[PDB]
Design an enzyme around this catalytic site. Structure first.
Site, PDB file in Angstrom:
ATOM      1  CB  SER A  50      -0.416   1.854   4.479  1.00 34.06           C
ATOM      2  OG  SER A  50       0.060   3.173   4.671  1.00 34.06           O
ATOM      3  N   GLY A  67       0.784  -1.217   0.000  1.00 33.03           N
ATOM      4  CA  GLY A  67       0.000   0.000   0.000  1.00 33.03           C
ATOM      5  C   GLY A  67       0.816   1.268   0.000  1.00 33.03           C
ATOM      6  CB  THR A  68      -0.455   4.735  -0.261  1.00 33.70           C
ATOM      7  OG1 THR A  68      -0.487   5.085  -1.650  1.00 33.70           O
ATOM      8  CG2 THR A  68      -0.268   5.970   0.579  1.00 33.70           C
ATOM      9  CB  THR A  69       4.537   5.472   2.388  1.00 38.79           C
ATOM     10  OG1 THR A  69       5.018   6.412   3.362  1.00 38.79           O
ATOM     11  CG2 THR A  69       4.820   5.997   0.980  1.00 38.79           C
ATOM     12  CD  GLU A 122       3.340   7.758  -1.860  1.00 38.74           C
ATOM     13  OE1 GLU A 122       4.318   7.877  -2.633  1.00 38.74           O
ATOM     14  OE2 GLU A 122       3.001   6.650  -1.377  1.00 38.74           O
TER      15      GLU A 122
END
Ligand SMILES: Cc1ccccc1CNC(=O)[C@H](CCc1ccccc1)NC(=O)[C@@H](NC(=O)c1ccc(OCc2ccccc2)cc1)[C@@H](C)O
Ligand SMILES: [Mg+2]
Ligand SMILES: [Mg+2]
Lengths: 250, 235, 241, 242, 233, 237, 198, 212
Positions: free
Chosen positions: F68, F23-25, F40
């Site tokens: 995330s 996943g995204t940070t 993010e």
């Protein structure tokens, strides 16, 4: 939240076996030896206190349990299964009997109730059978003394004398040799001690052995006086000291 | 519960397989009574005989069963059969007709065969009863929930061999005393033990109440079985 | 509390459990139904295997659902008891609410509904049973014969058979049943029924059992002596050429 | 074997797909929608000459303005018919009017969805999809005469003409040619009867095939054997002359 | 990696993937193309209806949820019906209890949470349908994309279904122009109709093929089919 | 899931974690009187409406949540977090302490590793806020595990974010103010984007500060956001 | 108040039941048969609250008929009466109890004896040589204490009954429009179609 | 309310008034107290309007359902018993309805069933139901013959409601007439008491209690 195995986990196999019940019996084999001997005026149930650690306090773990004032139990197999069976057994003696008839169940009936609890763990969804065999010894006014074995399948059988668990085959032989129908309780305790010595690996004394009797009424154990028709429990756990006295004459 | 390609119920078949290893139970019906005999599972000297009743059970005062298979399953069923008899008695003030009780037990067995994904009961019953409509009756029920009526029948081990023998020596006009002899002869012939002795046996009758006009169940005490075993010449 | 689906669709479109329920019927004792001009006759085979039975008390394959309707079946004997009980209850309930006994079609439609229902409910298997339902509607003399199967399909037949070797006896009935000419009476209709079973039974002793249904709640079973006379007469009459 | 509502890697419901294959094994059923009515016809297909064929109900009345023909595992269709009838009669109770054909179809398709066990988000009172397709035909004042094809997938399509069953593949191509928006009810009757005869395994007579229609005026009718016979004379004579 | 990891929605693959949900996503890609886009004043759905034969009706792809909200679908249709009825009720609930029109964003959140529970419950499949939702609420025109995974994103424009990647690239390119198309309903539709064309290996989009929906500032959500779309072909 | 492996592990939970790493940070930073959350947002396309796909969530009035992994799972947790916070406030009058709130989520997430009819959550959540006695920042993994943090990161750029986070802790042992930590959050989110530089991103920030927001959770927007973006832009080069 | 009488003679049981159905100030019917046949040799008559009366009767009838078909057998009058009592016993402690009193007259083919059961709505059962429900008993019990003999023929029983109906017609304040009379014996249930002026 | 139905040589006469009341208030004079369940079935209404109206309309639906399910029209006996049994489920909840289900089937012949909210269900040749029943009964009983012509029977019906409409404060408005045959209901019109009273007084020389 919610069970998925709402089906029987004990099923019949092509040959007619009920695997899980077989495998629970194999668990009983692996467990520490316990035994029962019936005398003319009492019953004795005995077992070995096999300890997890020398740092453990073995007095805090009873393998012998009072079920009612005149009925007691011992087991071989998985300890925790025993413990919870004992809880259910005590309760059921009240809910299905004392709360109805104002007296404690006779031995066979209580054994029958225990058997039912175990039978069910053999048929219900999402459970394994209990990994124990019990020896239940007791007394009632109309039946006298009795000793019952109860198996993981739910089966029970009355015994004059028997042994379950590890050294059970040899110990049963040693009992057929020694048992007769003229035995006083003191003779039976003596035989129980001898039979148990073949089974015990380490030390054999009042600290490492657990032994209870269904003998005579113990009015000093009742806790109250006044009502003359209440005479006290027949169940009695022998003390460490009491065991040792019968080992110096063994 | 599920069907096989053959249209067989796996679990029922295997339950019946289990039963064919249980000690043979024989039931023979005569005009003046009924015989129930069964062989105990290879026992031991230390087994209490006087306080034991593993294969024969009283249902009401006029009906009994012989068991083959898992005792613990049989006790579950016996107990409900006992209640059913008492419900009927309470509803109608009449003892339950034998067939009605057998059908009900059988229907409980059928249920475990069709819904719920529980294992069937590993039990076969021989029912021995008397009622005022059909007189003496003998019925058989197995884990499928099927039931049938008989003049002579066995369940458990060696039914195959025991059935052939009963077919041979059974005659419609038998007295109870003749049926007693037949049941013990048949057990003796088919046993996987050496001698068929008293301590390997459970035995019961349903007669015409010694001298009365009423119906009486005798569940033989061990000593009685020893006598009736000498009488019929097997010592 | 268990509803895991046992009857489901196969790649090629069949419901496997129903198809296997039919195999259970295929191996059940043969049953046959044929309808005359003013009657219907039901015949069933009893297996040779066990002959130490008690015929007084053994459940027979023909059952009364109500006083004017009967049921025979092939397949699992225990399964049939569940259908028969339900059918009987429905019959009383119909008299209670509509104030009239059931028509044969109605009772059939009901039994078929119970069967169908067991093919699409979680954690139950289909009935390993096929039925023949026969009788007369209240205040009617026109005979009725119906057949159900584990799928819940139902239909009326001039004559029909189910169970083991039903293939052979159906073959026999196709040739011997004339639709314009039905058997004129009880006597001759019973005879044809016995004949069809004789193609499969091969002793037909008390192994063949017969039941006759006539208009207005007139249902009678036949004893051994009566069937005997039919069996003997059939094999004697049919020999010389 | 894993689940009853699992997706295949292509993104299709396994059990739904096979139920469609069960329909392909059923008898042929044909519907044609005109401007003077809708015709429903079916292949009876007795499994033996001893079966009394007029006991083969494969065209049923739902309401006076709605009839249907079925094809597949036909016993599965009992409770669909019961539901449909109840919906129609119920609608009339609540609203004192006729239920729209489209609405009735949607109701039947909602019922067909309720398979599984009780999927999370709401409850499914059925263990498998239905193994039967329906051709629902009727008339309402809004949208006139209509023919819908109800699938155990719970989708429904309206059709000018439609064939379902074992004969369906061939019968549909046939309809693609013969159907035009002008057809009278008598023309449509002949087309159903013609196309059935093409795809049937017996020779088509007034016993192995059944005809029905639904008109705004006379409601929904199942034609009796005497009437279909005279239309089967009439189709013989028209084709033998072409 | 692919083996015993697509049994149900209750299993993670060793890669952290949920194959049942990924397979449900594949039913969308199988569905007929549909396009949604918006400016500040209006939002428009355009859908390619699909028949199953030449004798059949084209099956409907646009569903009205409320006066200020509606959606188009791609994938399993019965799932669209299940989901739109839920949304119809949520809209209805907000009107009756709070006398309030449901924010399109809240409808996003709600649909997302409903989808989610079917990605975690044993013996229940995920929803197998993609949805595009348009509406006019108290903060203007809105367009959402709904994936069966539960992911809902607010977009200026987008497309889902078979060969939809065409329309999406066009809309990415047209952005600055169609965002400004304000107070002109007919120009935005014509912009959306031409956007759906980029997704045709098919045929020429006919008067049965085409499905258009609109909602905006002073227009209730309304569906256009048959004769009424002719003027955009 | 209810399945222990031969060596005591839970392979299903381990696989759940790979979904998180995928996943995204997202990050969280504990300043001397509050907490800062940043995430993010990958821009898939210019068609995505800017500022209008809000990932950071509020629970009650005083708690922020960022996560995330599978976004839907995170929303499922926050829904439950909210029910759990309402329930607490109802009986006890006071809004839920952050460690109390931590455990509620903890137990709920752990529950989903007890049964075969359920899959563990495919998220890690960074959450916190101000209560009766100070600021708290937490991170909760798919297994149910959670601890207190000075700073926390999860997702794609988890490693580089922790490296930056570790530095801040070393240079500023005496506090970092809310206004400062906001800037640094923006910075760290820029310095985890380096991995996913092929696709464009958008920055979201929220904070909960005793002196700056009066202990309520607020989204960093407008001039404050822009200034933090500049600080990160200037300090990336 | 509904007259419900029963008398047991030597070889039969005779039931007599008033024909009127009165609601308010109106007699709606003068030919009401307040009876249900439960089986070929068992008859039950009933009186009580307006709706429960027929509803109870027909429910019992459905049950006994179900039994007969299941067992291909006719339950003894004593078993039917026990079934009926229990149904009423359960009913009295239910949410809305059946307000019906009954007479069960049966010929027991296995004992060759007639049998009469009086059961009230509480489930109070008792076997009697003769019985009645409602006010009518306040006249008929004393008359029959006098005139009744255990060895009476069916015909003597009908005279004794006529004597009972005459007393009620003379002394009861309500017009019950005469009775329908029914005889239960070995050859089943039959109605004496002439009694109103016999 | 007054409603009646009787059987005779030539079928069934169903007649009802049309007045609705709430207390002493005349709510309406033009109310429909007959429901036409199907071409061969009629139901009458007395007591609570809603109770009757709602449950007899429902009965219609249930009857229609039987037709579809059984491919045959429902018997009068069974139609009546549906309503009978429903009403019984509600015993003690305060439903208030006096009802007659009248019709023809081949198997039954012409048949009348009285059904009330107490659960009472009776078969008979003559019933009057409603607060005016006694008044209708007086006229009806004293001129009833089995062999009345169709024309006579319709009039006796008509006349009996008039009798009741005149004396009972809660009856009136208009008479609605029906004849049920083997073929089977035919409507014989609405007859306003406003005119009918005076006409019947004139032609018949009855109603001498009335001045002028
Ligand atoms: C057969 C039938 C069928 C159709 C038309 C007329 C009739 C004959 N029949 C009546 O005219 C009855 C007589 C009175 C009667 C009523 C009920 C049983 C027996 C006799 N009138 C009504 O039912 C009128 N409504 C009312 O009387 C009421 C209805 C509801 C009320 O609600 C009050 C209330 C509201 C809330 C809480 C508590 C009480 C008050 C009056 C209706 C013509 O508007
Ligand atoms: Mg688990
Ligand atoms: Mg991390």
């Amino acid at each position: 939240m919610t069970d998925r195995y709402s089906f029987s986990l004990t099923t019949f196999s092509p040959s007619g076996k009920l695997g899980q019940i077989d495998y629970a019996l194999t668990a009983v084999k692996q467990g520490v030896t316990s035994l029962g001997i019936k005398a003319t005026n009492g019953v004795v149930i005995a077992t070995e206190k096999k300890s997890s650690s020398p740092l453990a306090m073995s007095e805090t773990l009873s393998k012998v349990s009072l079920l009612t004032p005149d009925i007691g139990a011992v087991y071989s197999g998985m300890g925790p299964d025993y413990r919870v069976l004992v809880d259910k057994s005590r309760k059921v003696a009240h809910t299905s009997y004392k709360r109805i008839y104002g007296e404690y169940p006779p031995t066979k009936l209580l054994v029958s109730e225990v058997a039912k609890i175990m039978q069910e763990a053999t048929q219900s969804g999402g459970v394994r059978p209990f990994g124990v065999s019990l020896l239940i010894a007791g007394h009632d006014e109309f039946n006298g003394f009795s000793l019952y074995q109860v198996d993981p399948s739910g089966s029970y059988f009355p015994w004059k004398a028997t042994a379950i668990g590890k050294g059970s085959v040899a110990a049963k032989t040693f009992l057929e040799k020694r048992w007769n129908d003229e035995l006083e309780l003191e003779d039976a305790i003596h035989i129980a001690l001898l039979t148990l010595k073949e089974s015990v690996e380490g030390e054999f004394n009042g600290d490492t052995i657990e032994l209870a009797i269904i003998g005579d009424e113990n009015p000093d154990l009742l806790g109250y006086t006044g009502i003359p028709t209440d005479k006290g429990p027949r169940f009695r756990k022998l003390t460490s000291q009491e065991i040792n006295d019968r080992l110096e004459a063994l | 519960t599920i069907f096989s390609p053959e249209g067989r119920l796996y679990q029922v078949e295997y339950a019946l397989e289990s039963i064919s290893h249980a000690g043979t139970a024989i039931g023979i019906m005569a005009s003046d009574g009924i015989v129930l005999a069964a062989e105990r599972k290879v026992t031991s000297t230390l087994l209490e005989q006087d306080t034991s009743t593993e294969k024969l059970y009283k249902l009401n005062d006029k009906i009994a069963v012989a068991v083959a298979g898992l005792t613990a399953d049989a006790e579950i069923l016996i107990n409900t059969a006992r209640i059913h008899a008492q419900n009927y008695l309470k509803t109608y003030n009449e003892d339950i007709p034998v067939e009605i009780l057998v059908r009900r037990l059988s229907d409980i067995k059928q249920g475990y065969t069709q819904h719920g994904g529980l294992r069937p009961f590993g039990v076969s019953f021989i029912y021995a009863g008397y009622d005022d409509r059909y007189g003496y009756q003998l019925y058989t029920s197995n884990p499928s929930g099927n039931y049938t009526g008989w003049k002579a029948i066995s369940v458990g081990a060696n039914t195959s061999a025991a059935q052939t023998l009963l077919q041979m020596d059974y005659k419609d006009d038998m007295k109870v005393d003749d049926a007693i002899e037949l049941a013990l002869k048949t057990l003796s012939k088919t046993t996987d033990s050496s001698a068929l002795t008293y301590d390997r046996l459970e035995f019961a009758t349903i007669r015409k109440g010694a001298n009365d006009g009423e119906v009486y169940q005798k569940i033989f005490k061990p000593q009685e079985i020893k006598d009736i075993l000498v009488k019929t010449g097997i010592t | 509390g268990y509803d895991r689906a046992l009857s489901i669709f196969s790649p090629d479109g069949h419901i496997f459990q129903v198809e296997y329920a039919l195999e259970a019927v295929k191996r059940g004792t043969c049953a046959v139904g044929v309808k005359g001009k003013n009657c219907v006759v039901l015949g069933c085979e009893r297996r040779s295997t066990l002959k130490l039975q008690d015929t007084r008390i053994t459940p027979s394959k023909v059952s009364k659902i109500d006083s004017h309707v009967v049921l025979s079946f092939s397949g699992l004997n225990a399964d049939s008891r569940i259908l028969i009980e339900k059918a009987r209850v429905e019959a009383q309930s119909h008299r209670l609410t509509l104030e009239d006994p059931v028509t044969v079609e109605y009772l059939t439609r009901y039994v078929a509904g119970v069967q169908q229902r067991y093919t699409q409910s979680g954690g139950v298997r289909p009935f390993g049973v096929s039925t023949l339902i026969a009788g007369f509607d209240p205040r009617d003399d026109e005979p009725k014969l119906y057949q159900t199967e584990p799928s819940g399909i139902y239909s009326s037949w001039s004559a029909q058979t189910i169970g083991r070797n039903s293939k052979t006896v159906r073959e026999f009935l196709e040739k011997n049943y004339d639709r314009k000419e039905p058997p004129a009476t009880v006597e001759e209709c019973v005879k044809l029924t016995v004949r069809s079973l004789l193609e499969v039974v091969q002793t037909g002793a008390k192994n063949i059992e017969i039941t006759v249904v006539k208009p207005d709640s007139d249902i009678v079973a036949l004893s051994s002596e009566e069937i005997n006379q039919y069996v003997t007469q059939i094999e004697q009459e049919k020999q010389e050429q | 074997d894993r689940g009853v509502s699992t997706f295949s890697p292509e993104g299709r419901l396994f059990q739904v797909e096979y139920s469609l294959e069960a329909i392909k094994l059923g008898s042929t059923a044909i519907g044609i929608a005109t401007k003077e009515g809708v015709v429903l016809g079916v292949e009876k297909r007795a499994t033996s000459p001893l079966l009394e064929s007029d006991s083969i109900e494969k065209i049923v009345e739902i309401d006076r303005h709605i009839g249907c023909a079925m094809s597949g595992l036909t016993a599965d269709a009992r409770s669909m018919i019961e539901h449909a009838r109840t919906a129609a009669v119920t609608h009339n109770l609540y609203y004192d009017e006729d239920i729209n054909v489209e609405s009735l179809t949607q109701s039947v398709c909602d019922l067909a969805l309720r398979f599984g066990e009780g999927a999370s988000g709401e409850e499914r009172l059925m263990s498998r999809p239905f193994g039967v397709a329906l051709l629902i035909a009727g008339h309402d004042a809004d949208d006139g005469y209509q023919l819908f094809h109800a699938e155990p997938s719970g989708t429904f399509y309206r059709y000018n003409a439609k064939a379902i069953g074992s004969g369906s593949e061939g019968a549909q191509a046939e309809l693609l040619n013969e159907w035009h928006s002008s057809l009278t009810l008598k023309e449509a009757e002949l087309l159903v009867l013609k196309i059935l005869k093409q795809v049937m395994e017996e020779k088509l007579d007034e016993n192995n095939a059944q005809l029905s229609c639904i008109t705004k005026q006379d409601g929904f009718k199942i034609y009796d054997n005497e009437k279909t016979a005279e239309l089967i004379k009439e189709l013989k004579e028209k084709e033998a002359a072409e | 990696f692919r083996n015993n990891y697509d049994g149900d929605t209750v299993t993670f693959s060793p890669t952290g993937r949920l194959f049942q949900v990924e397979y449900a996503l594949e039913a969308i890609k199988q569905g007929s193309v549909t396009v949604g886009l918006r400016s500040n004043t209006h939002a428009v759905l355009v859908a390619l209806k699909r028949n199953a034969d030449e004798l059949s009706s084209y099956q409907k792809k646009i569903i009205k949820c409320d006066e200020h909200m509606g959606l188009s679908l791609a994938g399993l249709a019965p799932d669209a019906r299940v989901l739109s009825n839920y949304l119809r009720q949520q809209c209805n609930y907000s009107s009756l209890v709070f006398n309030r029109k449901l924010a399109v964003e809240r409808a996003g959140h709600l649909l997302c949470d409903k989808a989610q529970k079917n990605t975690q419950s044993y013996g229940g499949r995920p929803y197998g349908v993609g949805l595009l939702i348009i509406g006019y609420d108290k903060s203007g025109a809105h367009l959402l994309e709904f994936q069966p995974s539960g992911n809902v994103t607010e977009l200026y424009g987008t497309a889902i279904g078979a060969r939809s990647q065409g329309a999406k690239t066009y809309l990415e390119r047209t952005l600055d122009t169609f965002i400004k198309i304000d107070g002109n309903p007919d120009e935005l539709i014509k912009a959306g109709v031409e956007a759906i064309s980029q997704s045709l290996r098919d045929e020429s989009l006919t008067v049965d093929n085409l499905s258009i929906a609109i909602v905006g500032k002073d227009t209730p959500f309304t569906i256009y089919d048959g004769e009424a779309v002719a003027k955009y072909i | 899931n209810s399945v222990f492996s031969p060596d005591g592990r839970n392979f299903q939970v381990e696989y759940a974690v790979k979904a998180v790493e995928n996943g995204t940070t997202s990050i969280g930073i504990k300043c001397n009187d509050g907490v800062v959350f940043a995430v993010e947002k990958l821009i898939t396309s210019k068609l995505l409406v800017p500022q209008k796909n809000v990932k950071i969530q509020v629970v009650d009035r005083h708690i922020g949540c960022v996560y995330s992994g599978l976004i839907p799972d995170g929303r499922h947790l926050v829904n439950r977090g909210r029910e759990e916070a309402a329930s607490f406030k109802k009986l006890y009058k006071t809004p839920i302490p952050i460690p109390a709130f931590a455990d509620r989520l903890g137990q709920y997430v752990q529950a989903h590793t007890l049964y075969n009819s359920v899959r563990p959550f495919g998220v890690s959540t960074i959450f916190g806020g101000v209560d009766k006695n100070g600021a708290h920042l937490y991170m909760l993994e798919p297994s149910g595990s959670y601890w207190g943090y000075k700073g926390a990161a999860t997702g794609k750029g988890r490693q580089s974010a922790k490296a930056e986070l570790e530095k801040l802790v070393d240079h500023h042992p005496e506090g970092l103010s809310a206004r400062e930590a906001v800037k640094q959050a923006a910075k760290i989110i820029y310095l985890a984007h380096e991995d996913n530089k092929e696709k464009d991103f958008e920055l979201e920030i929220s904070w909960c500060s005793l002196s700056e927001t009066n202990g309520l959770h607020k989204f960093v927007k407008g001039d404050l956001l822009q200034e933090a973006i500049d600080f990160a832009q200037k300090e990336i080069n | 108040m509904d007259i419900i009488l029963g008398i047991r003679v030597q070889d039969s049981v005779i039931l007599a039941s008033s024909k009127a159905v009165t609601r308010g100030i109106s007699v709606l019917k003068d030919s009401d048969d307040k009876t249900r046949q439960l089986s070929p040799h068992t008859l039950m008559s009933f009186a009580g609250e307006a709706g429960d009366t027929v509803q109870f009767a027909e429910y019992i009838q459905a049950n006994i008929q179900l039994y007969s078909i299941r067992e291909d057998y006719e339950l003894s009058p004593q078993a039917v009466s026990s079934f009926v009592r229990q149904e009423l016993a359960k009913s009295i402690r239910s949410r809305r109890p059946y307000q019906v009193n009954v007479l069960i007259g049966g010929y027991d083919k296995k004992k060759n004896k007639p049998e009469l059961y009086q059961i009230d709505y509480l489930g109070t059962k008792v076997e009697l040589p003769y019985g009645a429900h409602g006010y009518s008993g306040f006249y008929t019990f004393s008359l029959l204490d006098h005139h009744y003999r255990p060895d009476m023929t069916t015909e003597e029983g009908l005279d004794l009954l006529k004597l009972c109906v005459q007393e009620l017609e003379k002394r009861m304040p309500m017009d019950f429009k005469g009775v329908i009379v029914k005889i239960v014996d070995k050859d089943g249930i039959r109605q004496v179609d002439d009694f109103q002026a016999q | 309310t007054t409603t009646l139905a009787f059987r005779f040589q030539g079928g069934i006469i169903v007649a009802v008034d049309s007045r609705a009341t709430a207390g002493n208030w005349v709510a309406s004079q033009t109310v429909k107290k007959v429901i036409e369940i199907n071409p061969f079935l009629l139901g009458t209404m007395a007591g609570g309007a809603a109770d009757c109206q709602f449950w007899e309309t429902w009965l219609g639906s249930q009857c229609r359902l039987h037709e579809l399910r059984e491919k045959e029209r429902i018997s009068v006996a069974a139609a009546s018993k549906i309503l009978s049994n429903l009403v019984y489920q509600y015993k003690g909840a305060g439903l208030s309805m006096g009802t007659m289900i009248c019709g023809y089937t081949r198997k039954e012949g012409p048949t009348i069933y009285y059904v009330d909210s107490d659960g009472t269900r009776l078969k008979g040749d003559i019933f009057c139901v409603g607060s005016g029943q006694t008044f209708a009964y007086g006229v009806l009983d004293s001129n009833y013959k089995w062999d009345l012509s169709v024309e006579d029977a319709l009039y006796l019906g008509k006349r009996s409601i008039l009798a009741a409409a005149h004396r009972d404060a809660y009856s009136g408005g208009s008479v609605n007439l029906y004849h049920v045959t083997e073929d089977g209901w035919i409507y014989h019109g609405n007859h306003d008491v406003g005119e009918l009273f005076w006409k019947v007084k004139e032609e018949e020389g009855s109603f001498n209690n009335v001045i002028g």
